[PDB]
Structure formats: structure tokens, C-alpha cells
Enzyme design. Structure first.
Site, mmCIF file in Angstrom:
data_model
loop_
_atom_site.group_PDB
_atom_site.id
_atom_site.type_symbol
_atom_site.label_atom_id
_atom_site.label_comp_id
_atom_site.label_asym_id
_atom_site.label_seq_id
_atom_site.Cartn_x
_atom_site.Cartn_y
_atom_site.Cartn_z
ATOM 1 N N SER A 136 -0.688 -8.540 -5.230
ATOM 2 C CA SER A 136 0.024 -9.130 -4.036
ATOM 3 C C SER A 136 0.782 -10.604 -4.378
ATOM 4 O O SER A 136 0.158 -11.278 -5.039
ATOM 5 C CB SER A 136 -1.040 -9.149 -3.047
ATOM 6 O OG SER A 136 -0.459 -10.165 -1.893
ATOM 7 N N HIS A 184 2.917 -4.779 -4.613
ATOM 8 C CA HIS A 184 2.297 -4.744 -3.165
ATOM 9 C C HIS A 184 3.050 -5.804 -2.508
ATOM 10 O O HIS A 184 2.618 -7.043 -2.581
ATOM 11 C CB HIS A 184 0.746 -4.526 -3.166
ATOM 12 C CG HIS A 184 0.444 -4.942 -1.853
ATOM 13 N ND1 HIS A 184 0.005 -3.694 -1.131
ATOM 14 C CD2 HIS A 184 -0.024 -5.812 -0.930
ATOM 15 C CE1 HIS A 184 -0.482 -3.841 0.125
ATOM 16 N NE2 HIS A 184 -0.873 -5.258 0.417
ATOM 17 N N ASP A 235 3.955 -7.852 0.948
ATOM 18 C CA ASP A 235 3.452 -7.938 2.208
ATOM 19 C C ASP A 235 4.682 -8.604 3.264
ATOM 20 O O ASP A 235 5.052 -9.598 2.989
ATOM 21 C CB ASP A 235 2.329 -9.219 2.159
ATOM 22 C CG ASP A 235 1.018 -8.779 1.383
ATOM 23 O OD1 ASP A 235 0.601 -7.536 1.950
ATOM 24 O OD2 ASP A 235 0.606 -9.230 0.340
ATOM 25 N N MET A 249 5.404 -9.441 7.118
ATOM 26 C CA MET A 249 4.596 -9.904 8.169
ATOM 27 C C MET A 249 5.741 -10.471 9.079
ATOM 28 O O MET A 249 6.790 -11.224 8.713
ATOM 29 C CB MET A 249 3.633 -10.938 7.738
ATOM 30 C CG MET A 249 2.614 -10.679 6.784
ATOM 31 S SD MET A 249 1.185 -12.261 6.507
ATOM 32 C CE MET A 249 0.372 -11.375 5.211
ATOM 33 N N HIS A 257 3.458 -3.321 2.519
ATOM 34 C CA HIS A 257 2.458 -3.517 3.402
ATOM 35 C C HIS A 257 3.086 -3.979 4.815
ATOM 36 O O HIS A 257 3.215 -5.305 4.884
ATOM 37 C CB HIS A 257 1.422 -4.341 2.755
ATOM 38 C CG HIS A 257 0.144 -4.427 3.852
ATOM 39 N ND1 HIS A 257 -0.923 -5.167 3.681
ATOM 40 C CD2 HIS A 257 -0.074 -3.692 4.910
ATOM 41 C CE1 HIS A 257 -1.745 -5.152 4.629
ATOM 42 N NE2 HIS A 257 -1.446 -4.133 5.329
ATOM 43 N N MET A 262 2.961 -5.314 7.882
ATOM 44 C CA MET A 262 2.228 -6.013 9.032
ATOM 45 C C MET A 262 3.099 -6.532 9.993
ATOM 46 O O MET A 262 3.138 -7.531 10.455
ATOM 47 C CB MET A 262 1.294 -6.945 8.315
ATOM 48 C CG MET A 262 0.177 -6.650 7.459
ATOM 49 S SD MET A 262 -0.573 -7.883 6.744
ATOM 50 C CE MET A 262 0.554 -7.854 5.269
ATOM 51 N N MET A 300 -8.230 -2.541 4.905
ATOM 52 C CA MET A 300 -8.077 -3.870 4.606
ATOM 53 C C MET A 300 -9.489 -4.307 4.340
ATOM 54 O O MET A 300 -10.631 -4.170 5.025
ATOM 55 C CB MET A 300 -7.641 -4.575 5.939
ATOM 56 C CG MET A 300 -6.263 -4.161 6.322
ATOM 57 S SD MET A 300 -5.156 -4.697 4.761
ATOM 58 C CE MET A 300 -5.533 -6.573 5.011
ATOM 59 N N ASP A 329 -7.495 -4.021 -0.083
ATOM 60 C CA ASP A 329 -6.575 -5.098 0.133
ATOM 61 C C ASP A 329 -7.253 -6.146 0.889
ATOM 62 O O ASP A 329 -7.515 -6.180 1.837
ATOM 63 C CB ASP A 329 -5.278 -4.843 0.825
ATOM 64 C CG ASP A 329 -4.158 -5.886 0.711
ATOM 65 O OD1 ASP A 329 -4.437 -6.977 0.014
ATOM 66 O OD2 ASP A 329 -3.466 -5.807 1.930
HETATM 67 O O1 LIG Z 1 -2.051 -8.329 3.130
HETATM 68 C C1 LIG Z 1 -2.985 -9.345 2.503
HETATM 69 C C2 LIG Z 1 -3.546 -10.261 3.681
HETATM 70 O O2 LIG Z 1 -2.906 -9.758 5.090
HETATM 71 C C3 LIG Z 1 -2.735 -9.463 1.065
HETATM 72 O O3 LIG Z 1 -2.387 -8.058 0.539
HETATM 73 C C4 LIG Z 1 -4.096 -9.835 0.741
HETATM 74 O O4 LIG Z 1 -4.415 -11.233 1.254
HETATM 75 C C5 LIG Z 1 -4.228 -10.015 -0.791
HETATM 76 O O5 LIG Z 1 -4.518 -11.407 -1.151
HETATM 77 P P1 LIG Z 1 -6.080 -11.787 -1.603
HETATM 78 O O6 LIG Z 1 -6.024 -10.873 -3.014
HETATM 79 O O7 LIG Z 1 -5.385 -13.348 -1.976
HETATM 80 O O8 LIG Z 1 -7.017 -11.775 -0.421
HETATM 81 FE FE LIG Z 2 -1.155 -6.613 2.022
#
Ligand SMILES: O=C(CO)[C@H](O)[C@H](O)COP(=O)(O)O
Ligand SMILES: [Fe+2]
Ligand SMILES: O=C(CO)[C@H](O)[C@H](O)COP(=O)(O)O
Ligand SMILES: [Fe+2]
Lengths: 219, 219
Positions: A7, A32, A34, A36, A67, A69, A138, A172
């Protein structure tokens, strides 16, 4: 059958192409990304316009796991498909009709992911598990990187793995060299890792380590 | 007169390099478009990208944040902490312009107030004396490269006539073809995207926009 997907949430977002290129050169199986919208979660990252620029910089080969969100996942399916995303992972909590959305994602040529937040019972994911390509469990509350792994989510992973033997299962949130063991033993085969890989001076070896721990569990 | 390039249509996977070229080319400021996919049908980036940009570009460059978001109250602190200089919110989006204006100043940022093309300029009257800058959109917000709306110029002229001290920014399809119309109406802050972004010699284009605008100002 285990894949590692870094990520880039806590990477240098001003140099995103560079961060992605080095993850790939380091052996990442996929990226991956993200997305948002500041509504579904309390943060804003980027959307399809960034994906489009990335796809232009990285070429066609790399696999993008989106992803999503976002509070209206229906709205971004076509834009993401046009931008060159491979998989569209939406949140179960973000829609009234997952069935219709799943259809639209496939109609737009993308793989289908379905994610659930920590507070959401895995039971609610089950009715759709036979219609999706990947379930995302998650392991932190979505919206922020660098949070602490929630080991209490593992029974969700194990239960899905038991009921849906062929289902790809992603974890994740706070996954690293330590916590990956719990994920792999629980049954996860797709590992997203942000801060653990991104704030390492040797991402190749972190990725190698995550994949190995995973593979040994898959065995 | 000040020229602030917009990076909407740049290589978003290389925002750092794009913005650096703009600053090295003598841009007076950077106009950063933040879209949450709700107030407008597109998503760009939010404060996390701003934080990385501020780290890449140094403490000196001025960031004008064009906040095309439905809840501008939400991102004031995050943008301030990220290092934004000016927080320009949409009058159509706020629940309480007065409270938000105060909060922006409490957070150490300058205050911008934007109106979409369909929004009468008289909506700004009650607030013009409390804000640092009015942004008169010259396209419907959401996307770059749209056609300049000359019919917006009477808004600019009215603002300049009624509030001589007010910085007035135009945004949307502004380039060397249309900058004179903006300057003659009274705009002194010019946002331009495509026309600057593609150039081999952005310095020359920026200088041209600035000079046209300045000479028109001197009448
Ligand atoms: O969707 C996510 C948070 O909303 C990220 O993919 C997730 O935080 C990955 O980061 P880390 O490995 O640093 O926790
Ligand atoms: Fe994510
Ligand atoms: O706010 C905007 C659109 O929502 C942009 O700042 C505007 O589109 C500038 O780009 P261009 O100069 O290409 O029109
Ligand atoms: Fe703008």
C-alpha cells in the site's frame, strides 16, 4: 498462491510514480491503491485521475487493486475501468445493493473485491462470497495508515477460508513481518502492507519475508 | 498581478516534479484543486498529497487550496497542518460562512471564497470584507480544459468596483487567449492549467500572462 501488494498510502505522494515503480522492482505482486473520498472515511487520498497517470507511467503490465473507500462506489466503476484498474474492491457498508454493483464491475471488465470494516460481521459478507474474486478483511479501521493490527479479526479470515476454500482473501491494516504470521495461519493469501514496507530501507527483503511466511501457511 | 498554475491536468503521478517546474519557472503561487467526488463529480487529492508536496517544495512556495469539497469545515486543520497558505472554500458548500472564515484564520491561513458560474456574485457581498480573496469560477468546477465563460466577467468587474481591496481570482479556461478579458474586468490572480502545463518554456507563458494582466491593470 500468496501475493504481496504494498500500500502506498504513507509513501511520498508527491512522487507516486517513483514509489510504485520501486515497489514493483522490489518484487511486489501487485499494487494496492487506496482511494478515499473524505466521506466513507475521514481522509482524502486520490481517485481515477491519479490512477490514469500511474497507468500511463507504469505501462499495462502491473496489477492495480483499487481499495474503494468511497461512499458511492457505483459512481467510480467506469472511471476506474477507463483509467486502467484491474480490480475494484468496494466496501459492503457503502452500498444498498452489492449484487447490482458486482455485475457492473464485471460488465466493465474488472475483477471484483468486497471489503468489510472491523465492526462488520463476516456473516454479512457470506451471501456474496461466491460472486466475488476477493474478500478484503480489514485489520484496522479504514482511513489511516500506521495503525495497530487488530488480531481479533483473524476468526473472520479463518471462517471465510473454511467456508470458501477457493476464495482469495486479503488482509489490510498493520500487517508486517510479525503480524503476517497470524494472517497466514488464519488463511489469508493476499497481504497488503503499507508502513512496514514503505518505511523500510530494504523493501525487497520485507516483501520476500511476507510472501514466504504466507506460502508456508498455504502449504 | 499573480499567476498561479493549476496542476489538474499535469502528470498526477509526478506532482512534485510538475510543481517544481512551475516554481522554477517563476510561478507566483500554486493553485491546488481538491475534489472529494461529492461536491463535484471527480476526485483529485486531499491534505496527504499537500503534506508531501509541502515537504518536496519547501517552506517558501504559496499554496492556494481550491476546496471543491462538500464539507469544507472538515479539512481546515488538516490542510493547515499540511502547510497550506490559503484555504479557498465554496460558498455553496458551507453551512456557516462566518464560522468557517473564523476557523480558517484561527488556523493561520488566508481565506478564499469561491462561487460557481450559476451562483450570483451578490452572494459574496455579505462576506467580501471578511475574506482575503474571491474566486470567480469561469468554468463549471470538476475538470480542467473546459471553455472560458466570458459571461462571468461582470461578476469580476462588480467585485473589483465594490471592493477595491479584494484580491480577485479567476479560474477555468484562463490562458493567453482569455487573460486580458479577466484583467480588464479586474482580476489580479490568474489560475491557468493546460496553457502553462504543456509548455517547453513555462517561464515565457507565465511572464506573458502576468504582463498582459499587469499592463491591463495599469489600464
Ligand atoms: O486501507 C488502508 C487503511 O484504510 C491501508 O491499505 C492500510 O492502512 C495499509 O497501511 P498499513 O500497512 O501502514 O496499516
Ligand atoms: Fe487499503
Ligand atoms: O478548479 C478547476 C476546475 O474545477 C481548475 O482550477 C480549472 O479547471 C483550471 O484548469 P484550466 O485552466 O485547464 O481550466
Ligand atoms: Fe481550481
Amino acid at each position: 498462491g500468496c501475493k504481496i501488494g504494498p500500500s502506498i498510502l504513507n509513501s511520498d505522494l508527491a512522487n507516486l510514480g517513483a514509489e510504485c515503480l520501486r515497489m514493483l522492482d522490489s518484487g511486489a505482486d501487485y499494487l494496492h491503491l487506496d482511494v478515499m473520498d473524505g466521506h466513507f472515511v475521514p481522509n482524502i487520498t486520490f481517485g481515477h485521475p491519479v490512477v490514469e497517470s500511474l497507468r500511463k507511467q507504469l505501462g499495462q503490465d502491473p496489477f492495480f487493486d483499487m481499495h474503494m473507500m468511497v461512499s458511492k462506489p457505483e459512481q467510480w466503476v467506469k472511471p476506474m475501468a477507463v483509467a486502467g484498474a484491474n480490480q475494484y474492491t468496494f466496501h459492503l457498508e457503502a452500498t444498498e445493493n452489492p449484487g447490482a454493483l458486482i455485475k457492473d464491475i464485471r460488465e466493465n471488465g474488472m475483477k471484483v473485491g468486497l471489503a468489510i470494516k472491523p465492526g462488520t460481521s463476516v456473516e454479512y459478507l457470506a451471501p456474496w462470497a461466491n460472486q466475488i474474486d476477493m474478500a478484503l478483511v480489514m485489520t484496522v479501521e479504514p482511513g489511516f495508515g500506521g495503525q495497530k493490527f487488530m488480531e481479533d479479526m483473524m476468526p473472520k479470515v479463518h471462517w471465510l477460508r473454511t467456508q470458501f476454500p477457493s476464495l482469495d482473501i486479503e488482509v489490510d491494516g498493520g500487517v508486517g513481518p510479525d503480524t503476517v504470521h497470524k494472517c497466514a495461519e488464519a488463511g489469508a493469501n493476499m497481504i497488503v502492507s503499507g508502513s512496514a514496507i514503505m518505511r523500510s530501507e530494504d523493501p525487497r527483503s520485507v516483501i520476500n519475508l511476507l510472501r514466504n511466511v504466507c506460502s508456508e501457511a498455504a502449504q
